[PDB]
Write a protein that binds this ligand. Sequence first.
Ligand SMILES: NS(=O)(=O)c1ccc(C(=O)NCC(F)(F)C(F)(F)F)cc1
Ligand SMILES: [Zn+2]
Length: 258
Amino acid sequence: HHWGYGKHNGPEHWHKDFPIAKGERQSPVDIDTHTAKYDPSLKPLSVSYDQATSLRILNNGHAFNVEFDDSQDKAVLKGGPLDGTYRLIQFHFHWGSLDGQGSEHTVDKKKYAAELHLVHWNTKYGDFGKAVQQPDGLAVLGIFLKVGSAKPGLQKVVDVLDSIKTKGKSADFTNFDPRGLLPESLDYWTYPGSLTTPPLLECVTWIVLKEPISVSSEQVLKFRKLNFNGEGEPEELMVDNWRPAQPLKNRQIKASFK
Ligand SMILES: NS(=O)(=O)c1ccc(C(=O)NCC(F)(F)C(F)(F)F)cc1
Ligand SMILES: [Zn+2]
């Protein structure tokens, strides 16, 4: 046993090994649209993924990560609330056992079926390990998934999932274009927060897109066939791998749009 999402080891238990769980800038949060302040000084986000180099997909026992080559300034996030250049290192999702739950952020207490996190690190810190120890070390771009029409750009991910069913399995995953996971609009909300899994470090500038993407029920079903457990262990379906909303405390969520 370590941390997870079960009754015995789930989010309510995390603070015992990670006391920052009750800290002042924990994520996710509910985004109250009537209270987020429009900030006309925010810049447009700049998402430069044309030279992205995906490498590998890995089931890590809590989600699956699609990992990228981050040894140079290939796929980067710049602009919006950010200073400097943040390199994409990996993306992953959180999702539910049912379509009415699964996202980590909520919008006016509305839950989406899933949430995509594109994780980037601030190049001024040299490496990802150094970046997570800094209050401005990461930028995570969060995108909500609603169940509807299929997302064609997601299908290459859903088709490889059978090959990484269990914890610690990985597969080569090259030539994957993460632009195919973006919505039309880059309007966003932003706030200072944390990693949403242990060690829950308070190193993240959250940029959460307003426009969800649509995925089909067949595609999200495939997420829910993954397993938390390793090969040969008792089957535990990888579902409901989301942390509930944490109190906002002394923070302000800004909107990029009016
Ligand atoms: N869900 S999330 O907020 O996007 C999120 C993104 C990245 C990480 C992450 O790198 N954990 C690994 C780690 F922090 F455990 C390490 F110290 F970095 F090894 C966790 C949560
Ligand atoms: Zn995440």
